[PDB]
Design a protein around this ligand. Structure first.
Ligand SMILES: OC[C@H]1O[C@H](O[C@H]2[C@H](O)[C@@H](O)[C@@H](O[C@H]3[C@H](O)[C@@H](O)[C@@H](O)O[C@@H]3CO)O[C@@H]2CO)[C@H](O)[C@@H](O)[C@@H]1O
Length: 435
């Protein structure tokens, strides 16, 4: 699918890919180089799996946190901006995409979660997490809710987990100490406990995901959500009169969102490295280029100084940078995805009641040092067999499969194909796995 003299680009489905495609059509008009923008599911998992070979796209877009792992594995071309080009972008954004000395991607924009609120339900939004139970009660009476946001992705809960002292890897000297993990300290427990009580007290549902929370906010049913700049386009379109503001504090500490830098990497395997560079440097990272993407879905505070100077005038963007400042830039180290999986698991388990907070975070501290494991058949499993534990073991494999953490829930569910011993159990092999 990668061919000399064409570009294939991958970007996430929540970003402005139609806008990016317009930049691509301008590139093609100038250069004769066809550009195809795709937004695959699980692209960030898909990329390391397929570029491992020589496949995948010429250009990949993601937050910088995933980049060091791609670099560590040799999947990224070292990029070669000249000093004048580097000077067009904020130094702290190049920092985000520097790994083991080398620039491994182009920074595009600075993403931080903010509190989004409906001015016609809550004209004065809460300054603290602690007042939200009371607010939800008052609003429940009016047939509304106070707050909904995606609880299936740790990105969204981390600001609260971090507020009172949770952290990922301790930053010491000038290094991240990957032996000093902070997902199971007192502050982390306090934050996750506070969320678990929101659910226990019926102020939030453990099953709330991205699209549920978005539909509810945009339909005027809940007073508040937590989301990024990319979400503002759809709220605009729904004519909710909304504001963007600083996240609530918890125990008098600011929420500390993990800050991402949307970045564009060039595939080490691409025979279009120069074309990709000229697309990125001369078409995308221009006022016009970024405008076109931003108009589709807002980017946040862009890395390009000249266009940010304009965007910075928007209170929404100032709100984004205030939240950014209170939070922390994500590491880009390879251990970041293991960290995220460990915390994903902990949050989902604690919130659903499958595990206590303390137990869930103890497991997260241990798992942050490991890697996401998948279900592997421990026996020949004939077609239509109801799964028992002795049929399933756990292994760190690529491509990943059903999460090993799902084994208990798999018990009694049926496979729809014969699964040989040692085969990775995939989601499409199990009947009813969608639920
Ligand atoms: O939860 C499992 C998940 O963990 C890792 O995903 C994290 C991303 O790496 C990280 O950048 C961030 O993702 C957010 C984006 O930055 C933002 O642009 C927007 O698209 O929302 C994203 C959150 O949904 O946080 C997530 C974790 O929540 C890991 O790399 C993934 O492969 C893995 O599936």
């Amino acid at each position: 699918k990668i061919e000399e003299g064409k570009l294939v680009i991958w970007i996430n489905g929540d970003k402005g890919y139609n806008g990016l495609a317009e930049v691509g059509k301008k590139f093609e008009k100038d250069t004769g180089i066809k550009v195809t923008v795709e937004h695959p599911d699980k692209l960030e998992e898909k990329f390391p799996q397929v570029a491992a070979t020589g496949d995948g796209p010429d250009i990949i877009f993601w937050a910088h946190d995933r980049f060091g792992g791609y670099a560590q594995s040799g999947l990224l071309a070292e990029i070669t901006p000249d000093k004048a080009f580097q000077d067009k972008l904020y130094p702290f954004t190049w920092d985000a995409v520097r790994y083991n000395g080398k620039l491994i991607a182009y920074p595009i924009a600075v993403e931080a979660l903010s509190l989004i609120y409906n001015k016609d339900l809550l004209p004065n939004p809460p300054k603290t997490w602690e007042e939200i139970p009371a607010l939800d009660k008052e609003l429940k009476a009016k047939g509304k809710s106070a707050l909904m946001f995606n609880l299936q992705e740790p990105y969204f809960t981390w600001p609260l987990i971090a507020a009172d002292g949770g952290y990922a890897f301790k930053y010491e000297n000038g290094k991240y100490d990957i032996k000093d993990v902070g997902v199971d300290n007192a502050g982390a427990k306090a934050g996750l406990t506070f969320l678990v009580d929101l659910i226990k007290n019926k102020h939030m549902n453990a099953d709330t995901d991205y699209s549920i929370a978005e539909a509810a906010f945009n339909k005027g049913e809940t007073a508040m959500t937590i989301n990024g700049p990319w979400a503002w386009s759809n709220i605009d379109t729904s004519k909710v009169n909304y504001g963007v503001t600083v996240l609530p504090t918890f125990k008098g500490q600011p929420s500390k969102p993990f800050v991402g830098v949307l970045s564009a990497g060039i595939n080490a395997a691409s025979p279009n490295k120069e074309l990709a560079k000229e697309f990125l440097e001369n078409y995308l990272l221009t006022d016009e280029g970024l405008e076109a993407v931003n108009k589709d879905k807002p980017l946040g505070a862009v890395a390009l100084k000249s266009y940010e100077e304009e965007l910075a005038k928007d209170p929404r963007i100032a709100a984004t940078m205030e939240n950014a400042q209170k939070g922390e830039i994500m590491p880009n180290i390879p251990q970041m995805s293991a960290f995220w999986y460990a915390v994903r698991t902990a949050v989902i388990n604690a919130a659903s009641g499958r595990q206590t907070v303390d137990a869930a975070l103890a497991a997260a501290q241990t798992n942050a040092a490991a890697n996401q494991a998948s279900v592997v058949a421990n026996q020949l499993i004939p077609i239509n067999t109801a799964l028992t534990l002795v049929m399933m073991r756990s292994e760190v494999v690529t491509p990943v499969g059903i999460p090993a953490e799902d084994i208990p829930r798999l018990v009694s569910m049926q496979v729809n194909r014969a699964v040989p011993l040692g085969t990775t159990l995939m989601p499409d092999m199990v009947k009813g796995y969608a639920a």
